[PDB]
Amino acid sequence: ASAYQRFEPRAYLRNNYAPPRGDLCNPNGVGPWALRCLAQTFATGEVSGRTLIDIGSGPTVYQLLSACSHFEDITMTDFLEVNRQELGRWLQEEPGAFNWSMYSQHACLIEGKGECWQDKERQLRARVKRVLPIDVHQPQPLGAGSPAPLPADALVSAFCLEAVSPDLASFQRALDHITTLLRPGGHLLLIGALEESWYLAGEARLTVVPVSEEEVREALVRSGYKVRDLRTYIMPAHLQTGVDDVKGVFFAWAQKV
Numbered sequence: 001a002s003a004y005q006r007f008e009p010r011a012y013l014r015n016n017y018a019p020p021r022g023d024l025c026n027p028n029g030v031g032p033w034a035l036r037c038l039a040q041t042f043a044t045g046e047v048s049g050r051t052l053i054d055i056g057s058g059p060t061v062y063q064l065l066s067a068c069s070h071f072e073d074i075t076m077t078d079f080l081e082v083n084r085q086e087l088g089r090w091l092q093e094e095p096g097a098f099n100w101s102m103y104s105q106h107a108c109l110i111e112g113k114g115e116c117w118q119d120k121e122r123q124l125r126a127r128v129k130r131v132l133p134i135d136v137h138q139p140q141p142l143g144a145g146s147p148a149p150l151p152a153d154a155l156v157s158a159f160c161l162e163a164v165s166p167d168l169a170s171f172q173r174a175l176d177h178i179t180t181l182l183r184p185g186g187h188l189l190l191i192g193a194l195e196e197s198w199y200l201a202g203e204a205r206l207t208v209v210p211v212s213e214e215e216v217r218e219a220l221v222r223s224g225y226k227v228r229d230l231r232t233y234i235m236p237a238h239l240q241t242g243v244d245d246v247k248g249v250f251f252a253w254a255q256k257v
């Protein structure tokens, strides 16, 4: 918790979204696999509506590339002021923003609608109406007077919950907490670290709750979801870089009610 105070966005970004973990050329990498999961899910046309909320966005945008064309009102969030500012830098095309163009181009490539990557980033930037502070540890994650439309038609969260929970029980609560923001029948797209206990973000050393696919599955069910899809990407040896001890990555498409 207080460890997130030393959390450096730039260090987080190069540890996870820059080579080798960031390479998108090899189809066997984690990046290609994750964008595929997201793109395919939205391609079924079943995950749709008007508003969407991204839980604990951190300083990344890749988790919304395929999503942005299905929701006109997008709300991004994060606990740390520093991450919200890193997002602004990219959203406002300000100086020193992280370059996600490779991810955009790959999203367009995977989506196969012949869209150019500039049009993709243009649309995402347009639909992101706000970058709000948030705390999944609060029964009301966003708060009282949330400028964000509620209940949202859909939610997206990547690598957040397990990274802010010390144990399985906390994980469940945080999931119950954010679940309240979702409209019954709505959809949840959850991505996270499998069996990880720590990860570095510069001077910050964060503790993580090691979870398994079945634990995630069971937790989604407990929060009142109907697991539409749950996949696992096992982390290959060469993506084991010393920035954490993650064993794999999971993708979950869950529906509320």
Ligand SMILES: Nc1ncnc2c1ncn2[C@@H]1O[C@H](CSCC[C@H](N)C(=O)O)[C@@H](O)[C@H]1O
Residues within 6 Å of the ligand: 004, 007, 055, 056, 057, 058, 059, 060, 063, 078, 079, 080, 083, 134, 135, 136, 137, 157, 158, 159, 160, 163, 164
């Ligand atoms: N109590 C809390 N509630 C919500 N988010 C929190 C939190 N404590 C920390 N976080 C945020 O959770 C994130 C975990 S890292 C995941 C970042 C991004 N979603 C990605 O896919 O890479 C960080 O951005 C961190 O600032």
Ligand SMILES: O=S(=O)(Nc1ccc(Cl)cc1)c1ccc2c(c1)CN[C@@H](CO)C2
Residues within 6 Å of the ligand: 016, 017, 021, 022, 030, 031, 032, 034, 035, 062, 159, 162, 163, 193, 196, 198, 199, 208, 239, 244, 246, 249
């Ligand atoms: O899968 S990754 O190795 N990198 C990646 C993810 C998605 C795309 Cl699209 C590209 C690269 C990746 C990304 C974020 C985090 C990890 C791994 C593991 N640690 C979590 C925080 O606990 C945070």
